[PDB]
Structures are given as structure tokens and as C-alpha cells.
Ligand binder design. Structure first.
Ligand SMILES: O=[N+]([O-])c1cc(S(=O)(=O)C(Cl)(Cl)Br)ccc1NC1CCCCC1
Length: 271
């Protein structure tokens, strides 16, 4: 035990359970409920004062959200220990990994699982996009879709964090180069950014590889994405119906992409 909220409600344990894009995640406890939570520290790095204003507001709206396919958000605050400042978020603890870990671990996803899990992602997104006002995820990826069990349901996570992962910022060329929706680079986005991201997720789940692996850096990716050049893995999608859905999601022009409604209504997404 290595920390607590200002109110003593949440404790942090000396048990690190994730480490990633500028965060460390620990096991924790809700002392009020006596139920285990994820204690995420957004790592000694500076948020802007403007981001903090947006974040105070966001955190309060996230605390209200419930849906089967969204990871629960409990509470948030700024915390320090020694010379390190972080923002803490406390969320529902997800103990069975991510779609990314699933693909790593079990090389392939069977089509009936793909269908069900993708329908659940769409239901989650429909839910967010239909909140008033709409919630746009803006950072959906296989590593932020959590599974409740190997045989369980999927829940979308890292709501909130997407605000602090900064599309229009200059960034280092380090690790695996990333893509996003064309319009996202300019921060000129709507819900359809999530549709694009969904398409990319489906592609990954269908191919068991990260799109654009044939690119060495994010500049090559940017040039391909904003010029309508598809990832090579697109051509490797085995099932034509799956490939068709992907293709309609990852259109360069946002106005031509499937809507979530149309995807949920697609033949594929009823059994
Ligand atoms: O956001 N992550 O990427 C994440 C990854 C892991 S991991 O150990 O699976 C790994 Cl080693 Cl980061 Br892939 C654990 C927790 C988290 N945060 C979640 C935030 C909201 C849902 C609840 C927890």
C-alpha cells in the first residue's frame, strides 16, 4: 500500500499491472465498497491548464456513464509524491487483458467471436455517440478494448485519457509508428473518427497484425493515410464480408464512411 485519495476512499497497492503510453497502472481498492479498482497514474509530465479545465469537467461526466460495453469510471484527482506529479484516475479493474493481448497470445480469432466482440464495440460507440452531448472516443485501438474474460464481453476503456493524447502535437519517432483518421491530424473530427478507428480494429482482429507494419515511421504512415493508400494487411482479409465492412469504415473521406447505425444493421451483425 503506497498511496491514497485525499478522502481516503481509494488506496493504491505496490502492484503495477500496466505501463504504457505515458501512464502506470496499479491495483487499488475502494475502501468504501471493498472492491478492487485500477489506479492509473498519468505520469510526471505536464498537462496544460486548459486540458486540466476540460478534464475536471470530463471526469464528472464520465463518473455518470454506465453501459455493458464501457469500462466504469469511478473518480479522478491530481496527486504528488516526492518530485513526481500525476493525475490519478480510478476505473473498473480489467483482469483478462485486451484485444491486443488476446491476438498476441492466441494468434487467431474465430469469426463467431469476432462478430460478437465487434458488435459489442459498436454498441459501446453507439452509446457514447448518443449521449447528450455526444462523447467521441478519438483514441480507440486494440490495446484499449478490454475483455471481461477469455470467454467474456468486451468493454471500451481509456475514456478521459483520449483528451490527453494529443493528435495535433509534435511527437517523437519511437516505438511502433501509429496511424489515426486523416482529419484527426488537424483536430477536425466528429463521430466518424471512431468509425475509422473501429475499421482499423476489425482489420487487426481479422489479420492478427497491426496495420501499416510495412511503414518504418509515422511520416510514411501520414503520407499514405492522407493520400488514400491502404495498409497492406487489408489485402490479407480472408472473409469478403469482413473486408467489405472494413473498407466502408476506413474511407479517407469521413463523409463516405459507414455510420454506426448502418453497421449494426448490416447482415454480418445479425447472427
Ligand atoms: O489503458 N491501458 O492500456 C491499460 C492496460 C492494462 S495492461 O496491464 O493490460 C497493459 Cl500491460 Cl497496459 Br496491455 C491495464 C490497465 C489499463 N488501463 C485501463 C484504463 C481504463 C480501463 C481499466 C484499466
Amino acid at each position: 500500500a503506497v498511496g491514497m485519495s485525499n478522502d481516503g476512499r481509494f488506496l493504491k497497492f505496490d502492484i503495477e499491472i500496466g505501463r504504457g503510453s505515458f501512464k502506470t497502472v496499479y491495483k487499488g481498492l475502494d475502501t468504501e465498497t471493498t472492491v478492487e479498482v485500477a489506479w492509473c497514474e498519468l505520469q510526471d509530465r505536464k498537462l496544460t491548464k486548459s486540458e486540466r479545465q476540460r478534464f475536471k469537467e470530463e471526469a464528472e461526466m464520465l463518473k455518470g456513464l454506465q453501459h455493458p460495453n464501457i469500462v466504469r469510471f469511478y473518480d479522478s484527482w491530481e496527486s504528488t509524491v516526492k518530485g513526481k506529479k500525476c493525475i490519478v484516475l480510478v476505473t473498473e479493474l480489467m483482469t483478462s487483458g485486451t484485444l491486443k493481448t488476446y491476438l498476441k497470445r492466441f494468434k487467431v480469432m474465430k469469426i463467431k467471436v469476432l462478430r460478437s466482440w465487434c458488435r459489442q464495440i459498436l454498441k459501446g460507440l453507439q452509446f457514447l455517440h448518443t449521449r447528450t452531448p455526444p462523447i467521441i472516443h478519438r483514441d480507440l485501438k486494440c490495446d484499449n478494448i478490454f475483455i471481461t474474460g477469455p470467454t467474456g464481453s468486451v468493454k471500451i476503456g481509456d475514456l478521459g485519457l483520449a483528451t490527453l493524447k494529443r493528435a495535433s502535437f509534435a511527437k517523437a519517432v519511437i516505438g511502433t509508428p501509429e496511424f489515426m483518421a486523416p482529419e484527426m491530424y488537424e483536430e477536425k473530427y466528429d463521430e466518424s473518427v471512431d468509425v475509422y478507428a473501429f475499421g482499423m480494429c476489425m482489420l487487426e482482429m481479422a489479420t492478427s497484425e497491426y496495420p501499416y507494419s510495412e511503414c518504418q515511421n509515422a511520416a510514411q504512415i501520414y503520407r499514405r493515410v492522407t493520400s488514400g493508400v491502404k495498409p497492406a494487411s487489408f489485402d490479407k482479409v480472408a472473409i469478403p464480408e469482413v473486408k467489405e465492412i472494413i473498407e466502408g469504415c476506413i474511407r479517407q473521406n469521413k463523409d463516405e464512411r459507414y455510420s454506426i447505425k448502418d453497421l449494426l444493421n448490416h447482415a454480418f451483425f445479425q447472427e
